Design an enzyme around this catalytic site. Structure first.
Site, short mmCIF file in Angstrom:
data_model
loop_
_atom_site.label_atom_id
_atom_site.label_comp_id
_atom_site.label_asym_id
_atom_site.label_seq_id
_atom_site.Cartn_x
_atom_site.Cartn_y
_atom_site.Cartn_z
N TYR A 225 0.81 -1.21 0.00
CA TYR A 225 0.00 0.00 0.00
C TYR A 225 0.85 1.27 0.00
O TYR A 225 0.59 2.19 -0.77
CB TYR A 225 -0.98 0.01 1.18
CG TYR A 225 -2.16 -0.96 1.07
CD1 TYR A 225 -3.19 -0.94 2.01
CD2 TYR A 225 -2.22 -1.91 0.04
CE1 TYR A 225 -4.27 -1.85 1.94
CE2 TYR A 225 -3.29 -2.83 -0.04
CZ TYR A 225 -4.31 -2.79 0.91
OH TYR A 225 -5.36 -3.68 0.85
N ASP A 226 1.87 1.33 0.85
CA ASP A 226 2.72 2.53 0.87
C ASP A 226 3.94 2.32 1.74
O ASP A 226 3.85 2.18 2.95
CB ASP A 226 1.91 3.73 1.37
CG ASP A 226 2.52 5.06 0.96
OD1 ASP A 226 3.72 5.30 1.25
OD2 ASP A 226 1.80 5.87 0.35
#
Ligand SMILES: Nc1ncnc2c1ncn2[C@@H]1O[C@H](CSCC[C@H](N)C(=O)O)[C@@H](O)[C@H]1O
Ligand SMILES: C[N+](C)(C)CCCC[C@H](N)C(=O)O
Length: 424
Positions: A225-226
């Site tokens: 996701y990040d």
């Protein structure tokens, strides 16, 4: 499997999304619902593509019956209403889709009051409030200014819950990597620390999703996701955190107070170097202090004695000096200030790191686990920061401040200069 699920799959089949070409069936995983590989998938292998006919972004809301009313609305606000609206309609194109969406996640925006008490003294708590509050306001202005006036497009009443619901859906399902798109098919892909790339989106319009890792038949397909979010950020955006202590961060806020007698000069120096009147420095565990933090700290604690560096004479090297240090009284001040803020903050928590670590040793509820991990991390960062400046207080005499640096070129021991002078 599941009602709306075994059906939701059917829905995509007719929309020409899911065919015997896509090797991945939806399944119930520990993380909720996820994509399980129907057969050995390879790196970069496009697992599934969705027709833009099925997006749900500003461009799709602008083209629906509420496209007009939402004309001047901000990006997310438009999608919030759209999502809510379609959830109401019994003939919506995403009928089988909404029957799949989780009414809630573990994001702190949903935590009860007791649950929130587990984050007592934490930066995460503050942040979550602010966000909850803001969203609320913006959502109440929408009702009074869009939902109620147009009682024809929005027949059913809209509660705050529905709002946060839509917001959460946004924050935990939007692919702002292309800025606020949603894809009912590739919306079911979960996060894994196994993935270390952070690039899976695509478009041929169309939304193409490719597994950044080779998954075997039966296993789940994930993505990153990040890589840059802190745990406090994964906690709010989604409802989860990682064990990775390198995700623990604590952001410090610095500002040149307007009551400072040198405010005008200090602000000129700061801005002249990329920093505003207020500045946020994110401090991560085991990572080195951010550039700018120290020189800004020194600027903040400047003081009468060293105020001479604010003169037009140094408006070209003042920052270089700030990076090298000003004076011992200046350094001692900022150290004192930082250490005090750390100790003060540390005292705001209701549990010790020992207790947290013991807790983690047993079985914790998802939200309890998040609070514990979040608060343990924050304490680690606060203590690391305090450790760093404690060391600084000791080496308070090893640094070569302004004065000393200025005299490192006196050339006291040169030549008997008078001889040459008495020659003309
Ligand atoms: N590694 C992980 N650990 C725990 N929850 C996760 C996760 N990755 C994703 N999630 C959950 O799924 C959300 C992302 S959307 C992914 C689909 C979701 N599993 C569903 O059933 O609809 C997150 O906000 C979180 O609640
Ligand atoms: C949960 N879901 C996979 C839908 C989105 C996760 C966040 C993806 C991130 N906004 C990015 O685009 O890079």
């Amino acid at each position: 499997l599941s009602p709306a699920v075994q059906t939701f799959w059917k829905w995509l089949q007719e929309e020409g999304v899911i065919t015997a070409k896509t090797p991945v069936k939806a399944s119930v995983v520990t993380e909720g619902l996820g994509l399980v590989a129907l057969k050995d998938i390879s790196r970069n292998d496009v697992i599934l593509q969705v027709p833009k006919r099925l997006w749900i972004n500003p461009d799709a809301v602008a083209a629906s019956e509420i496209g007009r009313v939402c004309s001047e609305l901000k990006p997310w606000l438009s999608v919030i209403l759209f999502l809510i609206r379609e959830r109401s309609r019994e003939d919506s194109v995403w009928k089988h889709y909404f029957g799949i969406l989780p009414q809630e996640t573990d994001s702190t925006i949903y935590w009860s009051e007791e649950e929130l008490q587990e984050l007592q003294g934490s930066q995460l708590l503050k942040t979550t409030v602010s966000v909850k509050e803001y969203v609320k306001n913006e959502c109440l202005k929408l009702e009074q200014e869009i939902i109620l006036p147009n009682k024809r497009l929005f027949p059913d009443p809209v509660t705050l819950d529905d709002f946060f619901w839509a917001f959460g859906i946004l924050r935990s399902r939007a692919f702002s990597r292309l800025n606020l798109v949603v894809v009912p098919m590739a919306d079911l892909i979960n996060h894994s620390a196994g993935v270390t790339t952070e690039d899976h989106a695509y478009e041929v319009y169309l939304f193409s999703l490719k597994s950044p890792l080779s998954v075997k038949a039966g296993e789940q397909v994930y993505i990153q996701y990040d890589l840059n979010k802190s745990n406090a950020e994964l906690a709010l955006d989604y409802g989860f955190i990682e064990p990775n202590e390198n995700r623990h961060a604590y952001t410090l806020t610095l500002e040149i107070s307007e009551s400072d007698p040198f405010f005008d000069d200090k602000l000129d120096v700061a801005e002249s170097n990329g920093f505003a009147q207020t500045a946020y420095f994110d401090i991560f565990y085991n990572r080195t202090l951010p550039p700018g933090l120290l020189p800004y700290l020194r600027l903040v604690a400047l003081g009468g004695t060293d105020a001479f560096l604010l003169e037009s004479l140094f408006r070209d090297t003042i920052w270089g000096h700030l990076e090298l240090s000003v004076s011992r009284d200046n350094e001692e001040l900022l150290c004192k200030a930082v250490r005090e803020a750390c100790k003060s903050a540390l005292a705001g928590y209701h549990t010790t790191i020992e207790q947290d670590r013991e807790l983690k040793e047993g079985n914790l509820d998802s939200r309890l686990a998040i609070a514990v991990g979040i608060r343990e991390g924050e304490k680690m960062v606060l203590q690391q920061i305090d450790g760093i400046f404690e060391q600084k207080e000791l080496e308070l005499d090893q640094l070569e401040y302004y004065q000393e640096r200025r005299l490192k070129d006196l050339g006291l021991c040169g030549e008997n200069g008078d001889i040459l002078e008495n020659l003309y």
